[PDB]
Amino acid sequence: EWQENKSWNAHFTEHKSQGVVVLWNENKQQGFTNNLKRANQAFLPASTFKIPNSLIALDLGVVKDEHQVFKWDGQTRDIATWNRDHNLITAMKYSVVPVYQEFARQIGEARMSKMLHAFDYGNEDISGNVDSFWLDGGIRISATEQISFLRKLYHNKLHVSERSQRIVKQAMLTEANGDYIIRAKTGYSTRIEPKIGWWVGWVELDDNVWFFAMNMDMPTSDGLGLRQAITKEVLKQEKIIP
Amino acid sequence: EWQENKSWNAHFTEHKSQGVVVLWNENKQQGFTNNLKRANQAFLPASTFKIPNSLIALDLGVVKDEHQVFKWDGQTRDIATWNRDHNLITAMKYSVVPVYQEFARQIGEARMSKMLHAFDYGNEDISGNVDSFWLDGGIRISATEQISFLRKLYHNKLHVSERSQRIVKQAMLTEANGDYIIRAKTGYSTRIEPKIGWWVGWVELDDNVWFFAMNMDMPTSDGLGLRQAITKEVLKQEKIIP
Ligand SMILES: [Cl-]
After folding, report:
1. CB < 8 Å to A170, chain B
2. Do B93 and A206 touch (CB under 8 A)?
3. In this structure, are residues B198 and B149 in contact, taking their beta carbons and an 8 Å threshold?
4. Where are the alpha helices (DSSP H) in chain A?
5. B19: which residues sit within 8 A by CB, 6+ positions away?
6. Scanning every residue of chain A, which has its alpha carbon at the shortest distance from the alpha carbon of B93?
7. Residues bearing N6-carboxylysine (chains A, B)?
8. Assigned CATH class of B2-237
9. Size of interface A-B (CB pairs under 8 A)
């Protein structure tokens, strides 16, 4: 029973941007967004695909656990954080695309396809390079679809092991304190227009959970930090966090 | 393997306090403390016993998962956060003694004893009431023994399921940001002298884990906040956290 809140567009305009924030009050089974149409527009997921990709790689044993080390391949890349060994925890934290490309190759085109259909993940289309389709292939997901997928991950309802889902939700840990916990993943789609930034995840309160998915136009990397700052202004506006 | 660092006494002195901080560098397999004698003095665990108690209740199915609700028994207590319903996450957060006392009665004397022996938890002596021996019974544990127990929990090496251990480590989440994660549990032992405060757990970094166990004299409730404050001053001093 979705509800539209145009007040929120203020946060996008003040930041010289356009985008959508979608929230879901789990207790009340009630959704809210600034833009019902853009909430259902599907885009490339970019690094937010590291959630289902990690889930699949764990459940198939391509990743043994959150401690297994995947060493640098020696090629210097532009993001310096990528030029070191990683585990699942730090691979996610620094969005190490190459580590997840290796996972995608080992998972294989056919297993990737079956699992994403099992998840009902976006348009379930992995057309393109096995190792790049979430950046420049056929897969597409909307903010509302992000929420639906996230709600199943949260409740361990996806068709992978419970252990797989616990580990990935651990790896998503972004922020925690005495008022709330945030489990989430950023994304930045640049290879295919329109270039957009994503932030999807949820906020755990003592007595409720609030899922969120936001994307926003992002022509230049200068505004990447607005992904989180706008979402948090909306969460503050709505009294979800202090 | 266990070095003394007396410069940390400055943090206790400046807070008109007395106690010990024990740190363990997991990568280097080396410990550090301001007071070797007090680091091996064993005390009642008070609410730090909620870690082993939770693990045992989970593995035995007394607790089904972190979402199962334990309803307030209607008895108003002086700590207002206890006079509501709780799950495992929030019973840990608010140290809700009565929920854990009910866990312990359902675990029972014999199961509690045998499984604490399996954990090599302190002196393994549950003498007293099954539902309060960790507040005023015979169980004693030192800071270096907290460390040993915590390290097993971290590595999933205790003799309970990986899932029980993952759940309890999730319930231990205290603080997280882009620099570190802290999983820990406070405790406050008042029923038998000497009255003391505890804080035990660890700091996850990208590339290392630092375990910590501290206890401090606590003649009045007014210095409770110094359990965390003094520990964080040592971590700052050692450049484990900024
Ligand atoms: Cl966690």
Report:
1. 166, 170
2. yes
3. no
4. 9-14, 36-39, 50-59, 88-93, 97-107, 109-119, 133-136, 143-154, 162-171, 226-237
5. B12, B35, B38, B196, B197, B214, B215, B216, B217, B230
6. A178
7. 50
8. alpha beta
9. 37
The answer on whether A95 is annotated among ligand-binding residues is yes
Residue found by looking up tokens 């994403």 in the block: A116
Q: Are strands A173-176 and A42-43 parallel, antiparallel or unpaired?
A: unpaired
Q: Inter-chain contact B206–A175, Cβ cutoff 8 Å? A: no
Ligand 1 centroid vs B178 CA: distance in angstroms? 14
- Under CATH, which architecture does the A3-237 domain have? 3-Layer(aba) Sandwich (3.40)
CB under 8 Å to B8, separation ≥6 — which residues? B21, B34, B234, B237
State the Cα–Cα distance between residues A132 and A181, nearest whole angstrom: 31
Do B126 and B138 meet the contact criterion of CB atoms below 8 Å apart? Answer: yes
Largest Cα–Cα distance in chain B? 50
Residue A179 Cα, ligand 1 centroid: separation in angstroms? 15
Residue A193 has phi, psi (to 5 degrees) of: -70, 155
Cβ(A166)–Cβ(B163) under 8 Å? yes
Question: Strand (E) positions, B95-160?
Answer: 141-142
Give the pairing of strands B30-33 and B2-4. Answer: parallel
- Residue in A17, A7, A10 with CA at minimum distance from that of residue A226: A17
Q: Which of A100, A89, A115 is nearest to A47 (CA)?
A: A100
Residues of B in contact with A71 (CB under 8 A): none
Domain ranges across chain A:
3-237
A131 vs A107: CA distance, rounded Å: 10
In the chain, the amino acid numbered A113 is S
Per-residue CA distances from B108 to A93, A181, B44, B112, B142 (Å): 43, 34, 20, 6, 25
Resolution in A: 2.2
